[PDB]
Amino acid sequence: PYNKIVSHLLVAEPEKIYAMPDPTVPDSDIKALTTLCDLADRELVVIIGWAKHIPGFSTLSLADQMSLLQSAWMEILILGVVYRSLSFEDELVYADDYIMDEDQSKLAGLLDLNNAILQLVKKYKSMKLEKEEFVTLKAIALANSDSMHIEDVEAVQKLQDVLHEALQDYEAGQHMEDPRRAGKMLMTLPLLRQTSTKAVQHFYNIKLEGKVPMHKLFLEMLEAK
Amino acid sequence: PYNKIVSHLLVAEPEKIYAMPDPTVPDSDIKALTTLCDLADRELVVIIGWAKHIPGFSTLSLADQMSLLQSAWMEILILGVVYRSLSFEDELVYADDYIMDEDQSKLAGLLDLNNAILQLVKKYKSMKLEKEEFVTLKAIALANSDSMHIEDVEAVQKLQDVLHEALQDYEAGQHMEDPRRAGKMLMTLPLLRQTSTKAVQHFYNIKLEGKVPMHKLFLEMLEAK
Amino acid sequence: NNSLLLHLLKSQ
Amino acid sequence: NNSLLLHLLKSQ
Ligand SMILES: Clc1ccc2n[nH]cc2c1
Ligand SMILES: Clc1ccc2n[nH]cc2c1
């Protein structure tokens, strides 16, 4: 017994996705970046399906559904990598078959970006982040993505309120020792925003340099305004 | 009667600073940017003094005091411009003698950055942000600035907790109609982070282009790692 | 318009 | 080191 929204988000959680880096291809920054962008493309399909499970998300206009996903997609991807990484030390679990350490981060040109993701990991390890809290924060990051393009501002605010309420009710029942735990969880969202912004900018620059092939969906979310 | 930390932050609030744009200089993007950077330099002196009033801030190492200010300075400047702007429509009150509208934003190359600051304004107008809430969020943005360089992580976490508690106790007493108002205030910090990051990047690029003179303190915070 | 994001939001 | 930020933090 905690909160039905939390229960519902847990059963909506997508299945594990394999990176499947091409074993015939020599190891290189281009291979690593190709593997990551391919993995992101596939995860984005599953993120779109998952969003439809979030109560009220479907009742927004298609424009408003697109705007929230265009602003939040990379925060959702990053929160996944952070959650998969909590039991690891200085490694990022992009996928069960794609665990990046510091050297692989240097070789891929991702040392600054992966260091920032590890800063999110460190904070969530010290807070002992629970799956329930992770799925609820992923939903809040979607609802709270601060798109410039929102048509129904009140509806988007009501989706924020519903999810925030779910987090607060979860924390009130599960963590009576810390009555400010919900707030402390919200206080982690600035770092996710910062990290997501840097990731989008880094991958947009790789897109511009033209050396890494990228699929249609990944490209469409990189090109969003 | 609300919370003594809130009371203390209100009396610590620095006096109004004038932009004093040089009336002998022709209007140009360089004049506008020179005026803004000069104003920021002066505000940063007052921000350093203000931080010393925040309970526990002074008891951190000088390294930790420098790290929090190196990460949060621009968020603190921006929150000032946003608060001064709440009674205005599509104008940003950098100072009582420096109110920027859309055209002046275009002429200064600041249309994208000022549009994002106006997005912070719009949200705080709909929430009816109070001075008490503004001074408390400025302190929380300092404590929660996610510096990579923190020595005493537990001390910085205790400063976050003290200020968060102050916000929650203020909201519990002043806004019983909305028991989630404190959380909703925390939920505004990602947009401040995003906007602050874009501002730092924009002004760092102006620094690189070498066409706008900048003072020592402003330069030192732009060059922080 | 011909957006893959839109098409995926509209389907199933 | 010779930082203006440090000098201002140390003073008054
Ligand atoms: Cl850049 C990036 C960030 C997070 C990811 N998760 N899966 C693929 C990813 C790629
Ligand atoms: Cl760029 C920038 C942002 C906020 C400011 N407040 N005062 C001077 C400012 C300059």
Side-chain angles (χ1 to χ4, degrees):
Chain A
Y2 21 85
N3 190 293
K4 178 73 174 296
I5 292 181
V6 176
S7 291
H8 187 64
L9 289 175
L10 281 170
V11 296
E13 183 75 355
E15 296 294 324
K16 272 171 179 190
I17 297 165
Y18 288 96
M20 283 167 277
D22 184 333
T24 71
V25 172
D27 276 348
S28 66
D29 61 334
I30 295 161
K31 180 182 181 183
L33 293 169
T34 303
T35 306
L36 291 173
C37 290
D38 182 296
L39 177 55
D41 197 69
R42 284 183 290 127
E43 275 192 71
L44 283 165
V45 172
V46 134
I47 290 165
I48 296 160
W50 163 83
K52 290 168 157 188
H53 287 287
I54 293 162
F57 181 81
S58 278
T59 79
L60 292 173
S61 71
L62 285 164
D64 275 353
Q65 295 179 48
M66 294 184 60
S67 297
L68 292 193
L69 283 165
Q70 287 176 327
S71 292
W73 66 279
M74 178 64 84
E75 291 186 39
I76 299 154
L77 285 177
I78 287 173
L79 250 186
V81 178
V82 169
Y83 183 74
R84 291 187 296 272
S85 300
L86 292 183
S87 71
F88 290 74
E89 287 201 77
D90 306 322
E91 301 178 310
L92 292 177
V93 184
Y94 282 90
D96 291 330
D97 62 342
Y98 211 77
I99 304 173
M100 307 193 45
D101 76 355
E102 173 158 88
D103 295 330
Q104 294 163 241
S105 304
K106 280 203 173 68
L107 287 168
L110 294 178
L111 186 57
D112 292 347
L113 171 61
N114 281 354
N115 274 347
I117 296 175
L118 282 165
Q119 191 180 359
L120 284 161
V121 169
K122 175 187 245 291
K123 196 191 294 181
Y124 286 138
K125 301 175 60 149
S126 62
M127 302 174 75
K128 302 175 190 281
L129 186 65
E130 297 161 358
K131 192 162 190 188
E132 289 77 4
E133 299 170 320
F134 158 64
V135 292
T136 310
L137 283 170
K138 274 194 305 185
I140 290 169
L142 180 63
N144 200 38
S145 56
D146 294 305
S147 175
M148 269 179 66
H149 306 284
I150 298 307
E151 295 169 351
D152 195 334
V153 170
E154 271 176 20
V156 169
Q157 172 72 59
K158 186 191 109 136
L159 173 63
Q160 287 170 25
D161 292 344
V162 162
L163 303 169
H164 175 193
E165 184 182 27
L167 177 69
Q168 187 51 80
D169 179 82
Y170 179 72
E171 292 306 337
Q174 190 68 17
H175 281 281
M176 295 185 191
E177 79 286 352
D178 177 12
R180 289 189 293 278
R181 184 171 165 96
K184 284 166 203 204
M185 291 291 171
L186 290 175
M187 280 171 72
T188 71
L189 290 173
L191 185 55
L192 176 63
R193 178 69 59 81
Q194 182 198 310
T195 305
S196 161
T197 293
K198 166 184 182 73
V200 170
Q201 283 175 343
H202 185 89
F203 282 93
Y204 193 74
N205 292 339
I206 294 163
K207 175 209 140 189
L208 288 190
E209 280 158 1
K211 290 190 160 135
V212 177
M214 291 179 180
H215 289 264
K216 314 66 147 58
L217 187 53
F218 183 81
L219 276 166
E220 185 181 314
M221 315 295 288
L222 266 182
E223 280 156 24
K225 289 169 186 197
Chain B
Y2 21 85
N3 190 293
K4 178 73 174 296
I5 292 181
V6 176
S7 291
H8 187 64
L9 289 175
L10 281 170
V11 296
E13 183 75 355
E15 296 294 324
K16 272 171 179 190
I17 297 165
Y18 288 96
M20 283 167 277
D22 184 333
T24 71
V25 172
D27 276 348
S28 66
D29 61 334
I30 295 161
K31 180 182 181 183
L33 293 169
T34 303
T35 306
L36 291 173
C37 290
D38 182 296
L39 177 55
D41 197 69
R42 284 183 290 127
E43 275 192 71
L44 283 165
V45 172
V46 134
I47 290 165
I48 296 160
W50 163 83
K52 290 168 157 188
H53 287 287
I54 293 162
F57 181 81
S58 278
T59 79
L60 292 173
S61 71
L62 285 164
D64 275 353
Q65 295 179 48
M66 294 184 60
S67 297
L68 292 193
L69 283 165
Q70 287 176 327
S71 292
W73 66 279
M74 178 64 84
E75 291 186 39
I76 299 154
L77 285 177
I78 287 173
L79 250 186
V81 178
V82 169
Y83 183 74
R84 291 187 296 272
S85 300
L86 292 183
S87 71
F88 290 74
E89 287 201 77
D90 306 322
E91 301 178 310
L92 292 177
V93 184
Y94 282 90
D96 291 330
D97 62 342
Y98 211 77
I99 304 173
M100 307 193 45
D101 76 355
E102 173 158 88
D103 295 330
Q104 294 163 241
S105 304
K106 280 203 173 68
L107 287 168
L110 294 178
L111 186 57
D112 292 347
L113 171 61
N114 281 354
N115 274 347
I117 296 175
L118 282 165
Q119 191 180 359
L120 284 161
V121 169
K122 175 187 245 291
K123 196 191 294 181
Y124 286 138
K125 301 175 60 149
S126 62
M127 302 174 75
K128 302 175 190 281
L129 186 65
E130 297 161 358
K131 192 162 190 188
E132 289 77 4
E133 299 170 320
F134 158 64
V135 292
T136 310
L137 283 170
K138 274 194 305 185
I140 290 169
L142 180 63
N144 200 38
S145 56
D146 294 305
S147 175
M148 269 179 66
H149 306 284
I150 298 307
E151 295 169 351
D152 195 334
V153 170
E154 271 176 20
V156 169
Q157 172 72 59
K158 186 191 109 136
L159 173 63
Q160 287 170 25
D161 292 344
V162 162
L163 303 169
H164 175 193
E165 184 182 27
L167 177 69
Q168 187 51 80
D169 179 82
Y170 179 72
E171 292 306 337
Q174 190 68 17
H175 281 281
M176 295 185 191
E177 79 286 352
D178 177 12
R180 289 189 293 278
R181 184 171 165 96
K184 284 166 203 204
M185 291 291 171
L186 290 175
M187 280 171 72
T188 71
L189 290 173
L191 185 55
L192 176 63
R193 178 69 59 81
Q194 182 198 310
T195 305
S196 161
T197 293
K198 166 184 182 73
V200 170
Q201 283 175 343
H202 185 89
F203 282 93
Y204 193 74
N205 292 339
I206 294 163
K207 175 209 140 189
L208 288 190
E209 280 158 1
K211 290 190 160 135
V212 177
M214 291 179 180
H215 289 264
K216 314 66 147 58
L217 187 53
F218 183 81
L219 276 166
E220 185 181 314
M221 315 295 288
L222 266 182
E223 280 156 24
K225 289 169 186 197
Chain C
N1 257 22
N2 208 352
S3 123
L4 189 39
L5 176 50
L6 178 61
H7 175 72
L8 291 166
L9 279 172
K10 280 163 98 181
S11 51
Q12 300 156 13
Chain D
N1 257 22
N2 208 352
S3 123
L4 189 39
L5 176 50
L6 178 61
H7 175 72
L8 291 166
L9 279 172
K10 280 163 98 181
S11 51
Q12 300 156 13

